[PDB]
């Protein structure tokens, strides 16, 4: 049984966008505000019974033993590599999650598509996002956080307004250099050209069932021979989507 | 409550009372009369109507962390304000309803609509029509849709009427706070000195109740969560509130 | 408090002061619009009385026990009727009985020979500022009807272009770097300009006070009260020539 | 005459007085040097020296009134404030700006400042560009700009202006209210002529010396002001202005 | 003796900062390299190959005049902010690419996976050349981290224009930012022209530290005595690892 | 005190000493081909020269005293440092002068300009040759006039290379400290990683002296004011500095 | 010496403790018989400094008896002959004073006799002075313009007024002459300087000595200086009349 320590990537992640929470149950139900994009009348909110189930996320990697069961490496090997990848892998689920099996019901999947019918002609990437921040209000919720890909964020970070003028400001840790006050989270999880916004603040919530724990093997598969101890680190949680209409997903159709 | 917009409640003066009914005079000004230009009072009365929101979701709730609590306190509580603004913004004074600002509001001089005005120029003229009440404009109320357009609205000039689309964010329009919402129907707008045209009295704090036996919940195994808020709207100088819609 | 001050009243435009008397004498700098020679100025042994202005709005009984909402109603709804109304006497007054010698009473007529062919509804004002300098003074600001302001601000040429116009402008209530005061106390088409900065100050004798009578006229019958906030002022004029009054050629 | 002296002035606008270095003195006139900076070509771009001297002039602001009532109410206390001090302080700039430096007038900055080299501005240059050029010319003097002296009117214009894009430049009306410009303070005053602007490094350029703090005096015996029962109130100040490096200042006129 | 902290220029993040940080205590260490095959759609599984890392040493010795050692506050000033950034300026030479022989280290380029030349086109822009690199990084289902190449090449890449004065995606500023496609750039001279390296050095491999950079100085060092003067030094022990070489691409700009 | 412009002194590393001279090693870094790109060493030595600023005047100012100091205080110093850059930026190693960076700087690689590069495109390439020293660029030095044009430059598309005339103020370029000083001759530039390529040591703070006894300051009522300062400039890796010019 | 303190003893003296003098200048009005009143013009007078320098040897640096004799028996006087320049012909800019000739009044030729000598002209000047309501006090001439005058011979082979015997020191028409080289030949000046103007000595004559001056230290030698700070003024410019012998 391993000693323990916690991790944390350089910048913030989606894990910071969703309202924190925890539980002592292997699952739990909740409700969905099926908000119809209904015309001026009875623009009411239908409801849906829905259930949330605790999933398990873990990352593994092997080593050779001894040195590990004696040197700090043991920590340096986890704190920098396992944990690093863990949280990094975590985003994928929350963001691009499949649902089936140990997969978490991804936001993008449940999130409401973008309204292309809402762009005009001389529009730029910047304009689109604006339109997005708007469609987020139709859910009776205000925008709260932006999610783009680094290769894309870097672009918007530096634009001219038909004049040398920089928008959002010059390249200043551009990500930290959050646009429109709202925070930005450029990760590898999100696809290139693909984005997702919404009121992550109230749109959905997260529950932690179990912290990140690490275990070794030395007896797995055929590792006893080649003596390649397998270290594993997992955690348990559950992602819930309350008002999917509070999140929009689109793409810069090139 | 929520954390983003600016609840109409903030625009209207606040306060509270003990009695479930109030009395007051109404400065019903004789606005446009190039002669004796004064105001005539109209002894009115306020009715403390109780408004509330009810959500029926699952039950088990009963057996799980105060979380729920972390629910309605943070989430469901918002659902109240949104519904609250509704009644206030507008509604059939009838029954439990309050006299919506739109109901008592005044028309909008179409004569001001000069050839060449834009959907953004409209609200502008409105600001003036407010001064007619001797008062001045404090805030404007519209829906996300129209606001959106107005905000990210260029011109043949090849430029935004306001700065970049950023304008949309931090609802401020020419030093006058804006408040988009569903309560405001599409195409309809309102302006005026809400800070000083009407006062809202809070009787009792929003109270919550739960049950199933309500309707057919006993069959669904759900629970009706609701929070009732006893409020009573009151208007002083309605001529200050301007109501109108775009030409399009 | 009276912060419906989305604008700045003349009281804020003029120069403040304070006295202890019930009346005060002063030298009226009879500035002659005299030629480039001495065009020398003259002095007049004038004086200023002290009227007592107040605003009233009858309300309903017992509003009393409810709480101090009786309170805000007063501060907020009430002053403004005070100051607003106050802004009236200051602007124009019959200078008779209880009426103060309003600026218009003493204001100097606007020269007509200055009107071109040939000049926009605003150009007229432009000329005013100049005529103001004809008294060895600058321009403090301009006072005109809230409507007329709209026409000035929201005004374009044959094409759609906001010349010094811009909803922004209306919001600012300032043009040519000069403070604009939209007050419905002054009839439309009319306008006043000058160096009020020091053209004439005001003296404060007694701050605003509140009085309520349930015995007033029909109060008893109709069954209600009548609040009343009092106030005592003293408007003075040091150089009326530094004030111009007139209307738009219509 | 006696001295009910003590009351000081206060305005919500930054006077040129503040724009210049503050230094008191005890004399009637003093001698200093003038860094005659030659806008000399790349080589001996050295600055010549000049033996100059400044005289301590005196500014005054008066007004008549009734001794009785005046000598009877805080009006007076307040009378001098918003009327005298306000006027005097205002008139002060009249000398520190467009001074004539004759008889009792001080050597105004503008009257000394160096003209604007219209040689820099080129085609398609908004007024904003003009100022951009100005800020530079003030550098050839080895001194960086400090603040700008502009007329209220023309300030309002420059303040709010777009750029062939909905982008507002400078931020006015928000920052419009005096406040700053490009990071340099702006002193909007009536004194400053129209269309005429002046910019420079007043910070280290010129300096002002005070010989005597402003003081008021009233005389119940002036010009038959006795028989007419109407004393006279006055308020004067003794000071001197020295313009170290002229080039550190430039005066121009927008493209009218 | 015992120092406190290095602190080099920091006007650019060295590969060290690019790679994953690590710290070992043994004079040697074993690990499992993820022999990821660029295997077709099916059993695209990664074989596990056992490996071993040796703990080499590294240091810099700008020797100089025996007079340079009078003033303390000052000289410590010399090395403290002068001597490290020298060394690290160096750690590269071993980290970036090394024979991994004698006292060298397993250079990134040494184990780097050759670029797929069969990806080029008629004439992809000199920039598109790198674009393919990032794509190939997926060969090992790994998200590229940063890009390390020769400073000069960077110049040409940044300053690009079409038939018009159209500073391509790049530009003067971008160059200053040393970050394209939203990926960090380390313009170290250690790389020669036409030589580049791309991959997810973030997790592709981590470096361990055995002993902080120490300092040693002497006179008896070779011909110093005579030619009166000294010799400063900065000893440091590191160990570069590699779990999936497939996560690193080398290749060369030819043209 | 309060100079506004950022002085070179603030662009170069700082430190002090108690000696009159210093010794070090000039990392003669050869721009050597891929192989033995090693850096040679040179036993260099720095001399703590002495610089000052003199001004003549009339004895009177000598007298109002107190004030005077209200002189040498914030007015003259400004003149000292202003001339301080002179020596640093460029000074003949001969005499009391110091090793001017330009006199120690390396030539510019014209091989980089290409038809189509704009004044600004040049200085851009310059930043590159800086990397040659294995160090990166930290700040640029141009004559006020140059910085001007360079700043609000444009192209066909009516746009500034930095989007606004303001660029001038708040000296910055691609995030690189720009120091516009008359010290730098027109049509002449200099860049590099001065931050870590050259240090300055203090041997004595600024000091002033007074004596009419100087020259003919007696026969003519006058006086020489001056403030000396003791410095020493060192150039560890000069290669980290580039210099060249433009067209005119 | 001249026994006539050059130009100095001709003007009212006084003291001052400042650097500027705001005096009232009576812009007289010759005008005509009626409003022959005199206007007033606020005028300012700056205080400039002037001194006389002389080189010496230190052997002298000792011998107060001696040195303390060289100075107040010649140095002190020598300075007067120097300051006389500013007073007489002074300019108004730099370290110069407002000389009388600069504020003087043009001579009336109108009074010249059909046929008279230079001496006669001076008389006219005296009269022209009284026009300002003020009586004349002294006269200013240039040695040579005093030479011929002292040798103005009637074709009667005899001097005018002059007789080697019948004669005294500098004096004419009852007024001093104060011959000086500082005055340009031909150009003269006359008026009631007594009240015409007055000088103010901010500080009495002060003598200082220095060695560190120039190459003296080297060429062992010394520098004695007598500093003097003063400032004069001008009341009735019409009181001073400058004339130029058209002959």
CATH of span G6-103+197-235: 3.30.2400.10
E partners (3+ CB pairs within 8 A) are A, F
Alpha-carbon gap, residue A126 to E253, rounded angstroms: 35
DSSP, residue by residue, chain D: -B---------SS--HHHHSEEEE--SSEEEEEEEEE----SSS-PEEEEEEEEE-EEEEEEEE--HHHHTTSHHHHHHIIIIIIHHHHHHHHHHHTT---STT----HHHHSEEP-TTS--SS--HHHHHHHHHHHTTTTT----EEEE-HHHHHHHHSB--SSSPPBS-TTTTTSSSEETTEEEEE-SSSPSSEEEEE-TTTS-EEEEEEEEEEEEESSSSSTTTTT--EEEEEEEEEEE-S-GGGEEEEE---
Alpha-carbon gap, residue E174 to E185, rounded angstroms: 11
Q: Which two tokens stand for residue A27?
A: 């699952």
C-alpha to C-alpha distances, D138 to A46, D145, D243, nearest whole angstrom? 69, 6, 15
Contact G83, G228 (CB under 8 A): yes
When the candidates are 3.30.930.10, 3.30.2320.10, 3.50.50.60, 3.40.50.10490, the CATH number that belongs to G104-196+236-247 is 3.30.2320.10
Q: Does the beta-carbon distance from A226 to E20 stay under 8 Å?
A: no
Q: Which one, of D242, D234, D238, D173, lies nearest residue D202 by Cα?
A: D242
Q: Does the beta-carbon distance from B57 to A47 stay under 8 Å?
A: yes
Residues of chain G found within 8 Å of residue F219, distances taken between Cβ atoms: 53, 213, 223, 225
Alpha-carbon gap, residue C152 to C143, rounded angstroms: 13
F partners (3+ CB pairs within 8 A) are A, D, E, G
Which distant-in-sequence residues (6+ apart) come within 8 Å of F58 by Cβ?
D31, D51, F221, F222, F223
Residues of chain E found within 8 Å of residue A225, distances taken between Cβ atoms: none
Q: Which two tokens stand for residue E137?
A: 């990084």
When the candidates are 3.30.2320.10, 1.10.40.50, 1.10.530.10, 1.10.1660.10, the CATH number that belongs to F105-197+237-248 is 3.30.2320.10
Q: Which two tokens stand for residue C83?
A: 């100051």
Is domain A13-110+204-242 classified as CATH 3.30.2400.10?
yes
The reply to whether C20 touches chain D by the CB within 8 Å rule is yes
C-alpha to C-alpha distances, E23 to A65, E237, E240, nearest whole angstrom? 16, 10, 10
DSSP code of residue E115:
P
Q: Which residue among E68, E70, E77 places its CB closest to the CB of F15?
A: E77
How many degrees, rounded to 5, is the angle at CA D188 between CA D186 and CA D190? Answer: 160
CB contact burial B114-135 (16+ within 10 A = b; e otherwise):
eeebebbbbbbbbbbbbbbbbb
Which distant-in-sequence residues (6+ apart) come within 8 Å of F64 by Cβ?
D25, D26, D27, D30
Resolution in angstroms for this experimental structure? 3.7
Residues of chain F found within 8 Å of residue D29, distances taken between Cβ atoms: none
Contact A141, A243 (CB under 8 A): yes
First CA to last CA distance, chain E = 51
Q: Does the beta-carbon distance from E81 to F195 stay under 8 Å?
A: no
Alpha helices in chain A (DSSP H): 73-77, 83-96, 107-110, 125-135, 150-157
Residues of chain D found within 8 Å of residue F145, distances taken between Cβ atoms: 136, 140
**Fold classification of D15-112+206-244 (topology level):** Major capsid protein gp5 fold (3.30.2400)
Phi, psi of E171 (to 5 degrees): 160, 180
Which distant-in-sequence residues (6+ apart) come within 8 Å of C229 by Cβ?
C54, C55, C56, C74, C78, C79, C81, C82, C208, C209, C210, C211
Alpha-carbon gap, residue F195 to F130, rounded angstroms: 12
CATH of span C9-106+200-238: 3.30.2400.10
User: Which of D65, D74, D78, D231 best tests the C interface by mutation, with the highest count of C CBs <10 A?
Assistant: D78
**Fold classification of D113-205+245-256 (topology level):** hypothetical protein PF0899 fold (3.30.2320)
Residues of chain D found within 8 Å of residue B158, distances taken between Cβ atoms: 164
User: Which of C160, C168, C190, C224 best tests the B interface by mutation, with the highest count of B CBs <10 A?
Assistant: C160
The reply to whether F237 touches chain E by the CB within 8 Å rule is no
Residue F127: its H or E element: helix F119-131
Alpha helices in chain E (DSSP H): 15-18, 72-82, 84-95, 108-111, 128-136, 151-158, 172-177
Residues of chain D found within 8 Å of residue G95, distances taken between Cβ atoms: 51
Q: Is B192 left (phi over 0), alpha (psi -120 to 50) or beta?
A: left
For chains F and G, what is the number of CB pairs under 8 angstroms? 23
When the candidates are 3.40.50.10380, 3.30.2320.10, 3.40.50.2000, 3.40.1440.60, the CATH number that belongs to E112-204+244-255 is 3.30.2320.10
C-alpha to C-alpha distances, E217 to E17, E60, F24, nearest whole angstrom? 28, 11, 15
Q: Which one, of D145, F31, B191, F35, lies nearest residue E152 by Cα?
A: F31
Q: Does the beta-carbon distance from G44 to D55 stay under 8 Å?
A: yes
Query: How many residues would you count in chain C?
Result: 250
Domain A111-203+243-254 architecture: 2-Layer Sandwich (3.30)
C-alpha to C-alpha distances, F150 to A166, E75, F173, F187, nearest whole angstrom? 18, 40, 10, 11
DSSP code of residue C216:
S
Strands B139-142 and B176-180: parallel
**Fold classification of F7-104+198-236 (topology level):** Major capsid protein gp5 fold (3.30.2400)
Alpha-carbon gap, residue D220 to D229, rounded angstroms: 8
C-alpha to C-alpha distances, E145 to A94, A148, E186, nearest whole angstrom? 21, 17, 11
Residues of chain D found within 8 Å of residue B161, distances taken between Cβ atoms: 166
DSSP, residue by residue, G4-27: S-TTGGGSEEEE-SSSEEEEEEEE
DSSP code of residue G75:
I
User: Which of B1, B2, B3, B4 best tests the A interface by mutation, with the highest count of A CBs <10 A?
Assistant: B4
User: Which of D28, D52, D55, D101 best tests the G interface by mutation, with the highest count of G CBs <10 A?
Assistant: D28
Strands F198-202 and F13-16: parallel
Q: What is the 3-state secondary structure (H, E, C) of F34-100?
A: CCCCCEEEEEEEEECCEECCEEEECCCHHHHHHHHHHHHHHHHHHHHHHHHHHHHHCCCCCCCCCCC
The domain ranges of chain E are 14-111+205-243, 112-204+244-255
Contact D226, D40 (CB under 8 A): no
Closest-approach residue (CA) in chain F for D28 = F64
CATH of span E14-111+205-243: 3.30.2400.10
Contact E146, E179 (CB under 8 A): no
First CA to last CA distance, chain B = 35
Hey, which residues does B231 pair with through a beta bridge? B49, B202
When the candidates are 3.30.2320.10, 3.30.470.10, 2.40.30.260, 2.170.150.20, the CATH number that belongs to C107-199+239-250 is 3.30.2320.10
DSSP, residue by residue, C16-60: ----SSS-EEEEEEE-----SS----EEEEEEE---EEEEEEEEE
Beta strands, E only, chain C: 24-30, 42-48, 52-60, 108-109, 141-144, 174-175, 178-182, 190-194, 202-212, 224-235, 243-247
Q: Is the dihedral of CA D72, D73, D74, D76 positive or negative?
A: negative
Q: Does the beta-carbon distance from A202 to B164 stay under 8 Å?
A: no
Residue B177: its H or E element: strand B176-180
Contact E186, E178 (CB under 8 A): yes
Q: Which residue among F157, F163, F175 places its CB closest to the CB of A165?
A: F163
Contact A195, A152 (CB under 8 A): yes
Q: Does the beta-carbon distance from F164 to A162 stay under 8 Å?
A: no
Residues of chain A found within 8 Å of residue E27, distances taken between Cβ atoms: none
DSSP code of residue C76:
I
Residues of chain A found within 8 Å of residue F160, distances taken between Cβ atoms: 163-164
């Amino acid at each position: 049984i391993p000693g323990i320590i916690m991790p944390g990537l350089r910048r913030l992640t989606i894990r910071d966008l969703l309202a924190q929470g925890r539980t002592s149950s292997n699952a739990l139900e909740y409700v969905r505000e099926e908000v119809f994009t209904n015309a001026p009348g009875d623009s009411d909110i239908t409801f849906s019974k829905q259930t949330a189930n605790v999933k398990t996320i873990a990352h593994w990697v092997q080593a050779s033993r001894q040195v590990m069961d004696d040197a700090p490496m043991l920590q340096s090997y986890i704190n920098n590599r396992l944990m690093y990848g863990l949280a990094l892998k975590e985003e994928g689920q929350l963001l691009n999650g499949d649902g089936t099996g140990d997969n978490l019901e991804g936001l993008n999947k449940v999130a409401t598509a973008y309204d292309t019918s809402l762009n005009a002609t001389g529009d730029t990437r910047a304009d689109i996002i604006a339109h997005a921040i708007y469609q987020v209000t139709e859910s009776e919720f205000s925008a709260s956080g932006i999610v783009l890909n680094p290769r894309d964020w870097h672009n918007i970070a530096l634009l001219k307004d038909n004049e040398g003028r920089y928008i959002f400001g010059g390249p200043q840790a551009f990500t930290s250099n959050i646009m429109w006050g709202l925070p930005v989270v450029p990760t590898k999880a999100q696809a290139a050209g693909t984005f997702t916004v919404g009121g992550f603040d109230m749109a959905s919530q997260v529950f932690d069932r179990m912290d990140a724990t690490v275990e070794v093997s030395r007896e797995d598969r055929d590792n006893f021979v080649k003596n390649m101890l397998t270290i594993l680190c997992e955690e348990r949680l559950a992602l819930a989507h309350y008002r999917p209409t509070a999140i929009i997903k689109g793409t810069f159709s090139s």
